[PDB]
Design a protein around this ligand. Sequence first.
Ligand code: FAD
Ligand code: FAD
Ligand code: FAD
Ligand code: CA
Ligand code: CA
Ligand code: CA
Lengths: 538, 538, 538
Amino acid sequence: WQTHTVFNQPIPLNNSNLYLSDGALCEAVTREGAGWDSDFLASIGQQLGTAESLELGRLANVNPPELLRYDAQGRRLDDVRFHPAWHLLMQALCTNRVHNLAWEEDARSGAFVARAARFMLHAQVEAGSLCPITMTFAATPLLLQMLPAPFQDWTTPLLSDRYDSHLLPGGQKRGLLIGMGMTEKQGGSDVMSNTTRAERLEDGSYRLVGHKWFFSVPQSDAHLVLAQTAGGLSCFFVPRFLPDGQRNAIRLERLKDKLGNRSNASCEVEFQDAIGWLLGLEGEGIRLILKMGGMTRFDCALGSHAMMRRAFSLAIYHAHQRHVFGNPLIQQPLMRHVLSRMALQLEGQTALLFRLARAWDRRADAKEALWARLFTPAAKFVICKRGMPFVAEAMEVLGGIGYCEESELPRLYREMPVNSIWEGSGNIMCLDVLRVLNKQAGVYDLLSEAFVEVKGQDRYFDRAVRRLQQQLRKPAEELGREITHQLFLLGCGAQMLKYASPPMAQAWCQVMLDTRGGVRLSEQIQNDLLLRATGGVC
Amino acid sequence: WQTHTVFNQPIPLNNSNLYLSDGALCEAVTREGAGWDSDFLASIGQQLGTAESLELGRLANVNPPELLRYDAQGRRLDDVRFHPAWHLLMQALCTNRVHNLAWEEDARSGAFVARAARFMLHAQVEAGSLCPITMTFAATPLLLQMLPAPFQDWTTPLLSDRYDSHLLPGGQKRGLLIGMGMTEKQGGSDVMSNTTRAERLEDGSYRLVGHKWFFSVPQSDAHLVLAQTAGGLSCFFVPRFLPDGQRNAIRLERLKDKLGNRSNASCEVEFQDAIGWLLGLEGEGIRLILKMGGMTRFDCALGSHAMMRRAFSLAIYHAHQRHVFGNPLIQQPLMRHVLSRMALQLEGQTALLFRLARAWDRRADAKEALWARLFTPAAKFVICKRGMPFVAEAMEVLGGIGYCEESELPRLYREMPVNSIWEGSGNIMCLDVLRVLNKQAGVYDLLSEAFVEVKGQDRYFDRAVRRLQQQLRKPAEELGREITHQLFLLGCGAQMLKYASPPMAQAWCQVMLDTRGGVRLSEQIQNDLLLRATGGVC
Amino acid sequence: WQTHTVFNQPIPLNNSNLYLSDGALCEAVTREGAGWDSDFLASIGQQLGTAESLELGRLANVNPPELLRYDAQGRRLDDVRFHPAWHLLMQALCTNRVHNLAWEEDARSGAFVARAARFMLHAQVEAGSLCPITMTFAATPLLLQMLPAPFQDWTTPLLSDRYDSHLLPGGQKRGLLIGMGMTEKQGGSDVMSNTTRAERLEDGSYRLVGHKWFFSVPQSDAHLVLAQTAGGLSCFFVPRFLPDGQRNAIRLERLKDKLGNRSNASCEVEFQDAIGWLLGLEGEGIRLILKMGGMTRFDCALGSHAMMRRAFSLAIYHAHQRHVFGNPLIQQPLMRHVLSRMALQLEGQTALLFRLARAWDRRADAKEALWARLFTPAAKFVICKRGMPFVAEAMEVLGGIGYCEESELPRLYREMPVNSIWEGSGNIMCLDVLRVLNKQAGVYDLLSEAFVEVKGQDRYFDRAVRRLQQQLRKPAEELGREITHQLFLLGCGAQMLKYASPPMAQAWCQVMLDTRGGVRLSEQIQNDLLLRATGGVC
Ligand SMILES: Cc1cc2nc3c(=O)[nH]c(=O)nc-3n(C[C@H](O)[C@H](O)[C@H](O)COP(=O)(O)OP(=O)(O)OC[C@H]3O[C@@H](n4cnc5c(N)ncnc54)[C@H](O)[C@@H]3O)c2cc1C
Ligand SMILES: Cc1cc2nc3c(=O)[nH]c(=O)nc-3n(C[C@H](O)[C@H](O)[C@H](O)COP(=O)(O)OP(=O)(O)OC[C@H]3O[C@@H](n4cnc5c(N)ncnc54)[C@H](O)[C@@H]3O)c2cc1C
Ligand SMILES: Cc1cc2nc3c(=O)[nH]c(=O)nc-3n(C[C@H](O)[C@H](O)[C@H](O)COP(=O)(O)OP(=O)(O)OC[C@H]3O[C@@H](n4cnc5c(N)ncnc54)[C@H](O)[C@@H]3O)c2cc1C
Ligand SMILES: [Ca+2]
Ligand SMILES: [Ca+2]
Ligand SMILES: [Ca+2]
C-alpha cells in the first residue's frame, strides 16, 4: 500500500529541559548572584520544555482572543474571550512570580536576576503571554509607590502568586495585571503629541476623554495612561472598575489583527469620561514612567534573546540528526561555521543581559543604576534588531519544514519584530543612548573604568575602544545606531574578557570586533560552543 | 454617549436545574422504577445546567475536531485532535456511566430507565458527545457476550466510569469507546450491498480490505464492522491497535463537514488489510446487531426528545419575560396556545419513551421485549421527524435573536436531522414496524390487551384503535408511515390514559386524535402544562 | 492501489433548466397572464441552473461579508466588504429586473406575475441576495410616490436594470437598493414600542437618534426607517449620503452571525443625529408601509416555495439514480408515496402563489386587492412554516450525504426559518388574517363567491368550507393558526378544482382535506406528479 519509506527525518525537539540545556545561562545565573534559584530553574525548565507545555503555546496562538463588545441582548460588554490554554499559561507565569518576584517583601539578593532567568524560560514556550507579565512587573513598584487611597486594598493581590481571571474590581481579586496606555493615532514615540484630556473633579480624581491606539491587555485590572492636563502631560491610574463597583468608561473598539504576538489581545480603545487618579504631579507623566520604561525595554531584549535561544536549540537538535551528502548536517564545515557563530552571538548576549540584570538588581548603587540606564536601551536596540535575521537563519537550517506553521519557527519569526517596534522602536533607543552619553554626569568615567579593567587583553577590543572614543568626540544624531552598536559590543566584550575562558573571549573578540571578517573558528571552539548550547555545563 | 436604552430583553436561561425543571421526567423516573436515582439526577441536573457546562457545549461545536492524517515528518498518523471542552464533556458522560450503567455487575432494577434519564440531561447541553456514548452503550453487551480471546483484558475498562483519551491499545486503558462501521458509499440502509471483504487467516482472525463511508468516532478503541465473507455478510471486532501493540490498518481519509453534530468526528475510512475478529457466525452480521440497532434507535428518539425539551425550556423562559403589545408574550392567547400544544407533545413523548425504557429494562419478559421491538422504531420515526419543526417553532418564539449562532437554538436546529437520518432513516423504521406487525408472533394480542385496558375512557382513542385495526387488514408498504404514526399515537395515548390526570389525558386525546382539529385547551390545562414544564412537580 | 470501487453514487443535479423542469410553474405563468415572458424565463432558467451559477451561490455563502467599521488609519468607515460572487449575483438580479420589473413605465399586463416567476428561479440558486431585491421591489413604488424633493434625481436609477456597487450618493449612481429599518431591541412585531426619535429641523428635514437591531443591507443607498415624532410613529427616508455629499450619521456596530442567510449582511446600527425626510404624515408610519409589508410577505412565501422546489428537484434527481435493495429508490413504494405527496404540496402552492401574484398584478380591481390583502399573510404563514420539514425530508431522501455542507441541502435547510421569522413572524400573519376577516368590508362575500364557483365538485372541499364557516362564527384569537391554515387550504383547493386536471384536483382534495388520512395515491397520479416536476409539461 506504500509508495516509499520515510527516513532521515529528525524527531522534533521536545520533552527537554529549557534551563539545563543552556550552559551560558546556568553559568550567568550563578555568576550574577541568583545561584540559590538554580534548583527551581531546573524544575520549571523541565516543566516548560514538555510536549504538553509547548502545545499550550501553539493553542494560545492559533486560537487568538475574541473581542466581545456587546452581549447577545445588545448591551455593552467590553470583554475579551481567550482559549483555555491562555489562562493556563498565565497561571504558571504568576505561580512562578514572573510578574513580581523582585517586589516581594523579603525578596532576596539576586531576585531581579532570578526573575530574568524565569522569564527567559517561559519566553521560549510562548511570547504573547509575556506582555501582561512584563507590564505588570514594570508597573508594580511604581503603583506601590503611588497607590491612590481608594485602592489601598490592591497591595495584597499585587504581591500574590495567583492569577485571577475573574471579571471583578481588583480589590476583590486574588492577583492583578496592570497595562500601559500611551500610544495614540498621531504618535507613540512622541507622547507629548497625546490629545487624551483629563479634567480634575471635585474629589481630586479626573475625568478622561480621548483614545489609545494600541492598548494591550484590555482585560488588565488597571492601565497607567498618559493624558494632557492644565499642568502638562500626566500619568493616570485608570482602573477597569471604579471604587463603587461600576465598570469604568473604557470602550473597546477593535482588536488588532497582528503579524505575531497573536495570543495577546491588543485593542483600540476610547475613553468616554473614564475616571483616572493622577500619579505624581501634573506634567510629570514622561519622567514618572522612565524607570517603568527601562524595565519593559529590558524585557524586550530578554524576550528576543530567549526566542533566539529557542530557535537555535531547535536548529542544532535538527542539524545533529539530519544527514546531507552522507554526513550529519552539523558536521558539514559551512553549516558548523554558521551555527558556531550563532552560538557565539548567544554567549555574548547572555553575558551582557545577565550583567545588566545584576545592575538593575543592585540599582541602589549609583554606578549600577547608571550602567543599567545606559546599556538597557543599547541592548534593546541591538538584540531586538538581531532577532529577525537570527531566527530566519535557524528556519533555513531546518529547510522547507521550518517554513510550515506546524513548526515553532514561523511563530518565533513572526514574533521577532514586535520587540523591536515596542516603546518608540530602535531609533528612539539610540537617541536615548546619545542623550545619556551627552547629559549624564559620570558616564565617561564609568566607561573608562570598565575598559581599563580589561585593557591589554585583546587587540581588537582595545582598537574598538579607541574607535568609540573618537566617535564620541562629535556624536552626531545620524550616527546614533553606529554609536549604540559599538557601545553594546564593548559592553559584551568586557563581560566576555572578564568572565569567559580565554579562547572563548578571543574567539568572541575576533569574530565581533576584527574589522576585516574572514575569521575562522578553531575546531575546539566550535565543539565547546555547540556542547555548551546543548547542556554540558549545567 | 448613548443613542438609546436597552430594555425588554430577556435574560437567557442558564444556571437552572435540567432535571428538576421537567415535571413529566421526574414523574416518569419514579413511575418506571428508577426513583432511587432521583437525588443523583437532581445533582447532575444542576451541574449540567450551569453557564460553564453550557459553554463547554458551545466550545466543542465551534472548535470542531481536526483530522491529523500525517505528522510533520510525513509519516502516517491517523489521529484526531479535539478542543479540550470535548474531553471534559466525555469525562462527565463516563463518570455518570451514560455509556454503561445498565451493564454493571449488580446493576439495579430500573438501571436502563435511570441511564435514559441521565442521557436526556446530557443531551440538552451537547449532542455530538452522545454519539460515542450511544454506540458504546449499545455495543457493550454484545462485545461482552462475544469478546474475542486476545481481548479478554478489555472487560474491566468496558465496565469503568473512566474516560481515557490515551492513544494506547484498549487493554492498557482505563475505559473504552466502541464504534460501528456499516455504511458504504453504495448504501447504508441496504448493508447487504457492502463490498468490504474479509478473508480468514491461519490463526482464525480475518484480513479486511474495503471502506466505510461514514465512520464516526474514529478514535474509538474498536469498531464493530460489517464485511462480506465466503459465508455471507458478517460482523467483525476491528480494534484500533492489534494484540501485539501495532496500529491496525485503518486509514482515515477525510473528515465530514457537517450541517450539525460538528463536535463529533465522522470520517471516511479505508481498510488496508486491517485485522478483524469474527463475532458469531459467518453470514449472521445483520441478525447479530439487531438488538444493538434497537438500542441506538432508542437513543436517537431520546436525543431528539431531549433537544426538543431544551428548545422548549428556552422558549418558555424567554416568552415569560418578553413583553409584546403591553403584556408578557406567554400571556398572548395565540402564543399561549402554541406553547401549550408544544408542552402537551412533550408530555406524551416523555410518557412513551420512559415506558419504552422500562420495556428495554425488563426485556427478560417476552412481552416487554416485544413491546420494545415494536415501539422503538415507531418512536424513532415520529419523534425524530417532529424534532425539526418543533425546534424551528421554539426559535420563532425567540424571534430574530433565535436565528443568531450566539443562541443555543441554531445548534439544536442544525442537530435535529441527524437523528432522523441515522440507521436507515425514517422509511426503514416504518418498514421495520410493518415487518414486526406482519411476522412477529404475539403482536396483535399484545396490542389488543393494551387497548382493552383503557377501552371506554376516551372516544377519540377508541375511534383511533378501530382505524388502526382497519388499516392493519391490508398493510400496504406505501402506508408504512401512516400506520407507524397511528401506532405511535396509540402507544402514547394508552400511557396518558393510564397514568396522566384525567383532564390532561382528555386534552392529549382530543388534540392528538380528534380528526377535526380546532381544539381549544382550557385555561386550567394550559396553566398546569406550562407550570409542569418549569419545575413545579419535582 | 485501491481498496474498493465507487458505485451507485448519483451524479448531483446541475446544468439543468430551472424553469423548463417545473411543469406547474410553466402552466401557472401562462394561466396568470405572463406567457409573453416564457422565452425569457426559459433562457434565465438555463443560465441560472449551470454549475457556474450554483457555485456563485455557494461562494457567496461560505465567504460571508465582513464589516469594516474603521479604516487602517483609525477613521470611521462604516462599510461592508463582500466576496465577488455576491456582486455577480446582484448584477444578474438587477439585469433581470427582479427589483423593479413591475414598476417600469410601460410595464405590461402580467408584469407582477412575470417578476414572481423570475424571482422564483433566482431563489433556487441563492437566497441571501434576494433580501435587497425584495426590499427594493417593495419600497420602490412607495418611494416614487413620496420621493422627497432633494432626491428627485433618484427616479432614473430606481428604474434601471443596473446594479451599482459604488460608494457614492444615490443620485450619482446607475441603480439603487433600498432597505427597511423597523425592528428595535425591545420589539420587531410591536413597532409602536420603537424609541428611535426624530426631531424636526428648520428646513423641514428631521434629525434621528436611536438604533435598529436588525438592519439588513446596510450598504443600501437608503433605508425607510420608523421613528417616533411629536405626532406619533412615522416613516423616514434615511439616505446613506446627504444631498451635500457627506455620509449620513448611521453607525454600523455589529454584523449578525446567522444560522443561514449568511451571504446577506444584517447589522446592528445606531443613529447619531442622522438626517431623515418624513414620508407622508407624522403618525402614519404603520399605515404607510402596510402595502410595502404586503409585498415583502409575498416574497417570503415565494422564497420558501422556491427553496422547497429546489430541494424537491435535488431529491427526485437523486432518487431516480440511487438504487436500494436492487431497485431505484424512486420506485420503492414508500419513497414514491412520500415524494408524490411532496410534489402534490408544491402543485397546490404554485397554483395559489401565482393566483396571488395575479391578484397583486390586478390590484386596481377592488376584489383582486382584497384577495391579495387576505391571502398574502395566510400564504406566508403556511408556506414558510412548511419549508422546514419539507426541506428536511428532501435531505433525508439523499441520506447522510444530504447532511454534509458540500450538498446544497444544508444551506436550504438553514435558510428556511428566516422567511418564517420575517415581519412579525407566523403569529402576526395569523392575527392579521383574523383582523381582515373581522374588519374588512366585503370579505365574506368574496369568499362565498369563490366557494360557490366550485361547490359540488368535491365532498372534502365542501365539508372544509362548512368547517371554516362554523369556525368564523366565533373566531378566537387562540385559533388564529387553525383558521389561517383552513383558509389557506381552501384558497389552494379552489384553484386546484378550477384549473388542475380532475384526477389531480381529486388527489389534492383527498390528501389535504380528507380528515382521516390513510389516503393512497393512484399509480397514474404519482407518475404524472413526478413527470410534471422534471419537465414534461413545459
Ligand atoms: C503588538 C503591539 C502591541 C502594542 N501595545 C501597546 C500598548 O499596550 N501600549 C502602548 O502605549 N503602545 C503599544 N504599542 C504601540 C508601540 O509602543 C508603538 O508602535 C511604538 O511606540 C512606535 O510608535 P508609533 O507606531 O506611533 O510609530 P512612530 O512614533 O510614528 O515611529 C515610527 C518610526 O519612526 C522612528 N522615529 C520616531 N521618532 C524619531 C526621531 N526623532 N528620529 C528618528 N527616528 C524616529 C521610530 O523609532 C519608528 O521606527 C504596541 C505595538 C504593537 C506592535
Ligand atoms: C452525522 C452522521 C454520522 C454517521 N455515522 C455513521 C457511523 O458511524 N457508522 C455507520 O455505519 N453509518 C453512519 N452514518 C450513516 C447513516 O447510518 C446512513 O446515512 C443511513 O443509514 C442512511 O444510509 P444512506 O445515507 O446510504 O442512504 P440510503 O440508504 O441511500 O437511503 C436514502 C433514503 O432512502 C430511504 N430508503 C432506503 N431504502 C428504502 C426502501 N426500501 N423503501 C423506501 N425508502 C427507502 C432511506 O430511508 C433514506 O431516507 C452517519 C450519518 C450521519 C449523517
Ligand atoms: C436574518 C434576519 C434579517 C432581518 N432583517 C431586518 C431588517 O432589515 N429590518 C427590520 O426591521 N427587521 C429585520 N429583521 C427582524 C425581524 O423583522 C424580526 O425578528 C421579526 O419582526 C420578529 O420581531 P422580534 O424578533 O423582535 O420578535 P418579537 O416581536 O419579540 O416576537 C417573538 C414571537 O412572538 C410572536 N408574537 C408577537 N406578538 C404576538 C402576539 N400579539 N400574539 C401572539 N404571538 C405574538 C411573534 O410572532 C414571534 O413569533 C431581521 C430578522 C432576521 C432573522
Ligand atoms: Ca568535524
Ligand atoms: Ca391568561
Ligand atoms: Ca412502480
